[PDB]
Amino acid sequence: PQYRLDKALLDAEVALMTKMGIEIIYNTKIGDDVSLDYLHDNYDAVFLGIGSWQSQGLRCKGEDMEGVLGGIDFLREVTMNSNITLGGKVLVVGGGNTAMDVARTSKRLGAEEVTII
């Protein structure tokens, strides 16, 4: 979240790094926009740092109903200044750092009462 890490610091550091001669191409998803065979043919080496960008579901009955959303997706829409819906009462399921970030961002986003399960 923004209150813990300022994005201006991150942007300034990446600008410092790209001054060194590293080219960053945004909005390019490998396998969906550009093949991996293309990168394999055109480059002397390939490194995959894709990360873990899926959210585990509730693993319960009715987990597919409307009104249930993952924590990672929620934080991504918060970051991109998109249009979200929260409501007065929000229940966050989990106990790691994702749950803490979701709960505190929800408290900042006008949720009147937030409870962690």
Ligand X SMILES: NC(=O)C1=CN([C@@H]2O[C@H](COP(=O)(O)OP(=O)(O)OC[C@H]3O[C@@H](n4cnc5c(N)ncnc54)[C@H](OP(=O)(O)O)[C@@H]3O)[C@@H](O)[C@H]2O)C=CC1
- Binding-site members are 4, 30, 53, 56, 95, 97-98
Q: Does 59 bind ligand X (CB under 6 A)?
A: yes
Pick between residue 34 and residue 116 the one whose CB is nearest to its own copies: 34
CA–CA separation, 91 and 104 (whole Å): 12
Q: Does 67 bind ligand X (CB under 6 A)?
A: no
Pick between residue 31 and residue 51 the one whose CB is nearest to ligand X: 51
- Which window, 8-16, 22-30, 82-90, 97-105, contacts ligand X (CB under 6 A)? 97-105
Category of 109 on φ-ψ map: left (φ > 0), alpha (ψ -120 to 50) or beta? alpha
CB 81 within 8 A of CB 106: no
Pick between residue 33 and residue 64 the one whose CB is nearest to its own copies: 33
* Interacting partner of 46 out of ligand X, its own copies, none (Cβ under 5 to 8 A depending on kind): none
